[PDB]
Design a binder for these strands. Structure first.
Lengths: 70, 172, 72, 242, 95, 96
RNA sequence: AAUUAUAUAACUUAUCUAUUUUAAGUUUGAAAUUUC
RNA sequence: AACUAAUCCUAGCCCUAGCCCUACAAAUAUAAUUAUACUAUUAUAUAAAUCAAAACAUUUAUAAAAGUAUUGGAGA
């Protein structure tokens, strides 16, 4: 059968206002009994080519609407 | 941790280490064409290791794609894929994909889809043919190999002719 | 810092420097710093073992004491 | 050897020593105090006396509470004290009949209730008894605050209680934003439940959460010994100047 | 709601002790269960119009889930709390 | 060093240690000491001793003069952060 | 085999759902008891 | 009076009493003990049966009142 959608997938405390749920961020390691912390984006301090990702074509300054066939 | 073996990023007609990626949505508008009826050529009738029926390479425009072969498909045959619902009976060449509205009652069909756009899921086995039992306005009756007769919209795509190995059901 | 191993013991964990943070380090997260529920039985055994060690030690001293009385 | 204190007293020793002793007194009192849940499926015996079969004399009687199983899903919802009763049944209510393994399931539902204090509508698992209790409590917010933890029988309800108690305690402008006049009415309406901010924080907190909270409260960056000596030197010199 | 009672009496443990339950004490009798019964009556206010159970604005007593599954679920009925009840009568007074 | 792609070793000059060798010319300390020289009673240096020897005289004079304030704690030798020094006391980032 | 066989499963009525004018029966049998 | 062997006392233990407990560097859960990224990370339903009832089936313990009464294939 032709599959629409990848076949692989086929077979409270935070809500409180004014208070902050405790999370294992202070522990510095995961524990199942503590809530998952909210992590801001990480800054390496330098650019790693191995982990670098090329920017999308449209964002490129040289991007042109007309298509050039090479 | 389970990843399916059918994980090739790009659809290709070349054998893949071999397995050939089949296409069961017969009317997929090809490149450099509008969503209107288009024609294709049966390049070669090859053998599919992963399916009982033999697959026929159908090529049109700038796109080449494998499809299931019907009873009489051979190399060099012409296959038409139409979305338009013909006012009159549309010329029927075995293996062509046409709306059930175009076809007349009694024509053997295969690779039918229960719902429009679902894609071919039944009558894909060797020797399986669906009979168009009845036709009324935008509704048609398609007999699937399970013996289940179902009523579907005329927009559903059906491929004329029986599947290859016509004597599969007669095997002794 | 002081951390609990999977055996329920409390041990000083020496921190390691990494180029990535802990939450982005799956392997560091994969490392287990949590004790399983079954360790409660082991904890009782550890307390009993400590008491057993003291009891055995007294027996060892008693045998030494025997000769002290015999010698003196 | 033999343990001087029984196993049940071991927990008491930990509570009385270490970080547990350093825990806030109000939270410790809340943990220490135990309140029996209101009976729901069992009623006390009508008579206080009966004829003792063995001696043929009138004897005092005792009440056996019916066992009721409360699934954790109840702790994530607002059940009015109802719970799953697991046991055996005799067909037609005669012991002479066959015994059939039966699990009795109270009819459970998920419905939405509006909270004035939080100014939000929450969709939660609820039973018919809770809805009547909410009406008897004169509002959903009142029901959460008025009902005790045991009668409430919901960790989320306790979580709501912690937020509601803290919200009332702080007079936080977060209640009904851009409507200060409406905010005052809600605080006045629920003025009875106003309590100190410190107490409200620890309401409904789990033991593991409480221990981490106290650890987070008591953890403090090491004092540079340079600073400590500087203050000590200045203090001693200042005393000498006097 | 389900109500059960032990078939076998548990021997008295005295003033300040806990009786030890046994296998025959584990068999219980079902005095009453709402599941076996038809749904018990529930008091609700119709917030819309439903076929042949009255009209919006009336107070009707209906079987607990029959009203809940049909009326309240579709939104036809609502629960009568004192806060909205006093609003309803005040609204009805202005009506 | 670091192994880059293609299984090729790429030595990193920074990660390669450089041996800092002291100049021993004119240095009178030798592997052994005289038996004539009396043995030294161990008096390990401590934070209190270091603070008393160097920091205490400065604060004592300044405190009597009254020119003492929090902003000038660094003047007496406090380091707000260990960054900027090649050798950082904590976390230790330098080898022996 | 005889005798039962509210394990379940079905149907009927409840049940729970929609609308709208598991329990009790029965049946199968998970089995039970005794005989051959 | 000879060979093979034998000779010995502490190595230590056992039970109560008493007593709860709060006893280097470097590497490590990745492949444990691999100095830095991979791959997210996770235990447990009545305890049962055996056994006793000489088999087996409900059933089978785990201060005085008193082994009285009841219960129980009224039997262990």
């Amino acid at each position: 059968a032709y599959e629409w959608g990848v076949r692989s997938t086929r077979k409270r405390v935070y809500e409180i206002p004014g208070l902050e749920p405790i999370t294992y961020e202070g522990k510095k390691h995961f524990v199942p009994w503590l809530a998952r912390p909210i992590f801001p984006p990480w800054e390496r301090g330098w650019n790693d080519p191995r982990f670098h990702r090329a920017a999308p074509i449209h964002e490129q300054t040289l991007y042109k609407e007309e298509p050039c066939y090479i | 941790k389970f990843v399916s073996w059918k994980s090739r990023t790009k659809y290709t007609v070349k054998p893949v280490k071999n397995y050939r990626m089949i296409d069961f949505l017969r009317f997929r508008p090809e490149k450099e064409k509008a969503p209107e009826p288009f024609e294709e050529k049966v390049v070669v009738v090859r053998y599919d290791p992963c399916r009982s029926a033999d697959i026929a390479l159908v090529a049109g425009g700038s796109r080449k794609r494998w499809i299931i072969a019907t009873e009489n498909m051979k190399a060099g045959d012409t296959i038409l894929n139409s979305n338009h619902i013909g006012r009159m009976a549309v010329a029927a060449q075995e293996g062509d994909a046409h709306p059930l509205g175009a076809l007349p009652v009694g024509t053997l069909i295969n690779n039918v889809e229960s719902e429009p756009g679902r894609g071919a899921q039944y009558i894909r086995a060797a020797g399986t043919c669906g009979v168009l039992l009845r036709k009324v306005n935008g509704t048609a009756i398609i007999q699937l190999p399970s013996k289940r007769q179902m009523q579907v919209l005329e927009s559903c795509t059906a491929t004329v002719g029986r599947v290859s190995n016509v004597n599969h059901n007669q095997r002794v | 810092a002081w951390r609990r191993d999977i055996f329920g013991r409390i041990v000083w964990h020496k921190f390691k420097q990494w180029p990535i943070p802990w939450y982005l380090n799956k392997r560091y997260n994969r490392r287990r710093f949590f004790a399983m529920p079954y360790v409660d039985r082991f904890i009782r055994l550890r307390i009993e073992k400590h008491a057993r060690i003291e009891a055995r030690k007294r027996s060892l001293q008693k045998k030494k004491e025997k000769i002290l009385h015999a010698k003196f | 050897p033999l343990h001087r204190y029984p196993v049940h007293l071991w927990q008491k020793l930990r509570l009385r020593q270490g970080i547990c002793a350093r825990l806030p007194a109000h939270f410790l009192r809340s943990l220490e105090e135990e309140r029996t849940p209101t009976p729901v499926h069992y009623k006390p015996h009508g008579t206080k006396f009966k004829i003792n079969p063995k001696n043929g004399q009138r004897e005092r009687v005792e009440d056996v509470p019916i066992p009721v199983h409360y699934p954790p899903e109840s702790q994530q919802g607002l059940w009015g004290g109802e719970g799953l009763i697991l046991g055996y049944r005799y067909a037609n209510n005669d012991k002479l009949s066959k015994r059939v393994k039966k699990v009795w399931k109270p009819q459970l539902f998920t419905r939405e209730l509006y909270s004035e204090i939080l100014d939000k509508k929450f969709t939660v698992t609820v039973t018919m008894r809770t809805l009547d209790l909410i009406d008897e409590a004169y509002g959903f917010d009142f029901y959460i605050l008025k009902t005790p933890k045991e009668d409430l029988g919901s960790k989320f309800g306790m979580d709501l209680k912690r937020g509601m108690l803290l919200r009332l305690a702080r007079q936080d402008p977060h209640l009904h934003p851009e409507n200060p006049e409406r905010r005052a009415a809600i605080y006045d309406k629920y003025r009875s439940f106003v309590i100190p901010e410190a107490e409200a924080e620890w309401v409904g907190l789990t033991l593991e959460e409480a221990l981490e909270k106290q650890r987070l409260l008591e953890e403090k960056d090491p004092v540079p010994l340079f600073k400590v000596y500087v203050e000590e030197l200045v203090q001693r010199l200042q005393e000498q100047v006097l | 709601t389900v109500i059960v009672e032990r078939w076998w009496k548990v021997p008295l443990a005295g003033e300040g002790r806990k009786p030890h339950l046994h296998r025959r004490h584990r068999v219980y009798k079902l005095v009453e269960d709402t599941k076996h019964r038809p749904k018990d009556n529930l008091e609700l206010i119709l917030t819309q119009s439903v076929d042949e159970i009255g009209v919006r604005g009336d107070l009707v007593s209906v079987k607990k889930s029959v009203g809940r599954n049909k009326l309240l679920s579709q939104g036809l009925a609502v629960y009568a709390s004192p806060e909205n009840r006093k609003l309803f009568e005040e609204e009805k007074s202005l009506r | 060093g670091i192994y880059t792609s293609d299984r090729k070793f790429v030595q990193i000059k920074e990660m390669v240690p450089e041996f800092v060798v002291p100049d021993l010319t004119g240095f009178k300390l030798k592997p052994y000491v005289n038996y004539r020289a009396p043995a030294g009673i161990d008096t390990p240096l401590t934070a209190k001793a270091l603070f008393q020897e160097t920091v205490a005289p400065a604060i004592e004079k300044d405190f009597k003069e009254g020119t003492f304030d929090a902003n000038n704690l660094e003047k007496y030798g406090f380091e707000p952060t260990q960054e900027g020094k090649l050798f950082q006391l904590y976390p230790k980032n330098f080898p022996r």
